[PDB]
Write a protein that binds this ligand. Sequence first.
Ligand SMILES: OC[C@H]1O[C@@H](O)[C@H](O)[C@@H](O)[C@H]1O
Ligand SMILES: OC[C@H]1O[C@@H](O)[C@H](O)[C@@H](O)[C@H]1O
Lengths: 665, 665
Amino acid sequence: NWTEIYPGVWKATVGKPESYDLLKAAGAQPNKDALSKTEKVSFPFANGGVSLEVSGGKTYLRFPLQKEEQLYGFGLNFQTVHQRGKILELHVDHYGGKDSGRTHAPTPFYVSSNGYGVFINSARYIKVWAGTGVRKDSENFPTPKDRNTDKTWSSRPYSDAVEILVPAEGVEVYVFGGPKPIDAVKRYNLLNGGGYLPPRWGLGFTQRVMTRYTDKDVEKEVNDFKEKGYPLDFVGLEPGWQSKAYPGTFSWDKSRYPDPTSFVKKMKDQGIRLNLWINPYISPDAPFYKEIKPYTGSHTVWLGLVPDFTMAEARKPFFNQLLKDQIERGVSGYKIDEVDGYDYYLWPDAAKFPSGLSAEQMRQTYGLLVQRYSAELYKQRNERTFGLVRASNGGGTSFPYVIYNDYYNHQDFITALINSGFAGVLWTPEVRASKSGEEWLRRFQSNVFSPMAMINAWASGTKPWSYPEVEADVKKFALLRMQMMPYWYSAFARYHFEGMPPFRGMGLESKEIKDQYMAGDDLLVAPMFAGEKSRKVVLPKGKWYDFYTGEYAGDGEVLDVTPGLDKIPVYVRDGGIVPMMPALLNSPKSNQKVDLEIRYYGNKPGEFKLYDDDGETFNYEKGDFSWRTIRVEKDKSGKVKGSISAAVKGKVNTVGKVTFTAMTK
Amino acid sequence: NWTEIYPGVWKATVGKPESYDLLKAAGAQPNKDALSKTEKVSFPFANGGVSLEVSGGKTYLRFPLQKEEQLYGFGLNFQTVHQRGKILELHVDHYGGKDSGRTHAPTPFYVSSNGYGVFINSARYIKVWAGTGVRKDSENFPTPKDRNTDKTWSSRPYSDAVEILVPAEGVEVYVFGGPKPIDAVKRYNLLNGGGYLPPRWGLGFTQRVMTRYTDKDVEKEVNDFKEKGYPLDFVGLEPGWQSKAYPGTFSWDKSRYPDPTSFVKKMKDQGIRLNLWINPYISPDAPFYKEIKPYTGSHTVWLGLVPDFTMAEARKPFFNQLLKDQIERGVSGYKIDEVDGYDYYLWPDAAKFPSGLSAEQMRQTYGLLVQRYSAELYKQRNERTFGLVRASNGGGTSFPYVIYNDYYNHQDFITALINSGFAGVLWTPEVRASKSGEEWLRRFQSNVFSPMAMINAWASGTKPWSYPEVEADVKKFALLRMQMMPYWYSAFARYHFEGMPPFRGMGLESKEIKDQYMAGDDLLVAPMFAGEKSRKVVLPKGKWYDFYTGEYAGDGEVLDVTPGLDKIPVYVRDGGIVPMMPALLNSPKSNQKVDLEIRYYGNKPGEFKLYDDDGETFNYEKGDFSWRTIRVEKDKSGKVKGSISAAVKGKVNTVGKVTFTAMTK
Ligand SMILES: OC[C@H]1O[C@@H](O)[C@H](O)[C@@H](O)[C@H]1O
Ligand SMILES: OC[C@H]1O[C@@H](O)[C@H](O)[C@@H](O)[C@H]1O
């Protein structure tokens, strides 16, 4: 039976579900308030064809499909966006070069073009046949043909269902109503708690430095950023901050970091936060080793113990060490590495954990656990965090982490960014190295139109200016990222409050689009790749305007575009609005007013909801935030006319002078 | 507890095993007689380290490894021979281009270089970590190192066990003693019933013809073989013999085969047997469709019903039709196609079968079932068969079928032939098409040193002579195949009686050898590949002689060989013997005496056991067979001296005049 638990959200419990699952692993709390405000809509499967069965130790699910229905999701795929006709086993792993279901966030959630979604709340590995099976008792069984004589004989005849096998005696399933595909995604995300509300400093630029950097090396890099006029909010430290790595001590190396408290404070006094690399695997020389040992798995990763983070006895020593030795010195956050795979690095499924949780369910949720309990340390102190994680899953929407990996195909990086929007996670196509200045700038351009603007120089030692043929353009895109901070922050506020993914695929207001994405509500981004002079851009219905010049670009048509090296193709919807702050080098503080230039595109009257609060604490949870409504139009003479709603009494107000600019002459 | 059930064979039952498994699926009967004659040997795991555990619904197995122990097996792999350090999920499938465990015969049997083997008797998909897991409580846990400072830090530290996960509440495990790796393989094979004893006609040449051939077309091809002087024993008919294919009617097409009884008889009267392509998927127009329908799975393959061959009610209509419409007309055997995969063609694991058998266990054993019940039809009539099958598994050693596939990488074809010897199945690297005459001859050369000498022209329409630059050499290798018939037949007799795989890897009397194999007891085959002028050949200790000239080649060393296009590198052990019959075009009948030239290589006194019987019935089961012992030496003057043991009273005797030839001048 399907219990309508929120508007457009239904829940069925099939058989006897396991006591551990994805939502429970994450400790994911629904945002009831936001959910209650969504439209009531009808059950998406109104005409039967749904079958939920327990048998032979497993749970068999079947959901119907109509002809010309297309599917999206099944997690963080890198080479496919359309999922109908695919066969997958959803299984946490480092991405392996093919979309098989093995990936960093193999979210068991899919979305239909008909405007609904389905989430399977199991922490097991899950098999999916997304319209490949052909059933003899199907209402749509194609007529059998003779391959010997009939030219129309087809190797892939019509399949009318999504079939899913969960290896357990039952499962919780959730179905999400529409009417549009994005509505289903938003409800799914809100069931997960909505997206995290990042700190403003998390949307600034981050530089990760080489593994071997000393505190002195870091101080110098910071000084070079300032001297050269490049923005920077947080520096990423790689494994050499620890006295041992692989496996880890979780303590500052005495030689590379003699005085941690002093170093963390100096960087902070200069506006620079720190984010620390960890993997969660415990060295014998870690100060809590003996205490944690009984609460660790049978198998090690890089010879380090694997904590069973489902046990308080493992959590307390691990997270206490992070709290006391780093967070309390001022460390802003973490990069939770290598909680994904490969199978030959992580523990095998044959491993045993002291809680009794299967190693399979541990593999599926390890990332979720480390995100969960690390984030909680920051929430307890009324401070936001923002960091990186190499694995996540269903249940992880609300965590303050962005996914990254060691793969590097640029096209595929963009495709993953698209799919991140169907998967309830954030993904950054990071910049590390490049053969050429061209590739370096192309990668930097797409990166600044993503959740996290980052160069990860852990091995490369690169900086934004390392490629001199393109350094001036790289600088421009770095400063653009800062200038766009109010646009991104408002987008992330929609992620938190309404569950709206800030980066997502097209047609989420015919053929597969793998290389364009929406970035916030107003911008269509169409990246260039190295070696290309031009590309096609498919524009949805409605008028679009050039992001740079403001000129009319097109409407419901395909463009051939030759942008030059200095531009990433970006197009703004009619009436679209991008609030721009000044090109600050550091994110603004909560007590700081910032002027805004409201760049308004096209001729349709536009409306933007600018989010404002202190940008660093959880005070917004008590209602200390505002949405400032901005409206812009051209008057009868063609001159820009704009308004902003008034600041609200008693609320934080960081909006300075506001000027309006009609970008379309 | 380990019950020693035969000499060098032990059985443990862990937990509660499933009532269906591989041995039961195959109906595999042990050859007690042959097994009782093997040496008693000690239990291979004498020092502990074995763990058999049931937990969380699954069976966890761990077997210890010593340092420098190497592993072989885990089924029919195409790119790897050494299996230590590999991670696999054993899963029946068409080979996918990588050794992941997905393959045609994913036999859950492995062999150690220390001289033992292990077989996991489950029809589930099975996970294997062959010395990749590193356990914290291991006796051999490497010392944790610091990757920040230590150059010796290793990403793959020492693992001391094979770990296997079976998804069931228990399992039967079998362990096989040594002392040598081949001894373990032989016992495994004998537990399965030994290899099938093929008919002599099955070791002749087979031509499969284009799908669209009519009976007239086949008659003509047969006449061309005879006219051109090429050998032929059986012709393969492809899907057009059926009135419908994909899915199938299992009845002769009225238009292409008007008079089946007459056609089958004409071909037979000319010495030519027929082997018929089937897949087991049922057309609505098949004459037994209505009867079988309730005993078929929920899902179809190419819109054909999938019989549950575990039910007598499915077996009877299916196999009765084959019996009455084909076997009783004289059809010699079948090619059981497309019982492997891919996942998007075969039924999904979510399918349901009317017997209640999981679709997983069905996938794992479907090939075994169709081999089993088809072979039985022939045994009931006291006639041997020999054919082809695209899937098999543990339990399938005794079946009269050779595996083939639609992959075509030549190197990998040879590697699969090597691995076939560790996997309890036969594999043929078939010939279909080639870009060049060179490739065509190279492929033909390796093929005639394999279980089945075959061109499969189902799509290509090729014949042995299709490439005129190499046609004379192709002919020579075809006639060689016939001349070598007594050598091959004796090798296959060892397969049946002693479990000795007729094709196998090296070191089965340091580094991985993927491109050489032993063919019978005496011949080391080292194939050339197209584009190569020369290759290395690693010779084991002991003297070796050139197969063609008889000259000394080497001893415990590596050769660089430039054979020419007209030769496949083959080397004969010291004292090795190849009995040669004449270059007949058709296999000899049971009532026929055949002269033999005994080609003796080197100088060590040699001994060969020539197997002899009627070559077509199961009378050998009643004791109507003989082993004729042949001994050859050079006398003090350097002249060949040979003997053959006397024919046995009352037994079939096909040996004619016997002459001896010392190949090494
Ligand atoms: O060794 C440090 C590196 O470790 C990798 O696992 C990670 O993906 C890299 O981004 C970097 O952190
Ligand atoms: O359609 C006929 C063909 O079918 C394939 O599945 C098979 O591998 C080929 O060898 C040939 O039999």
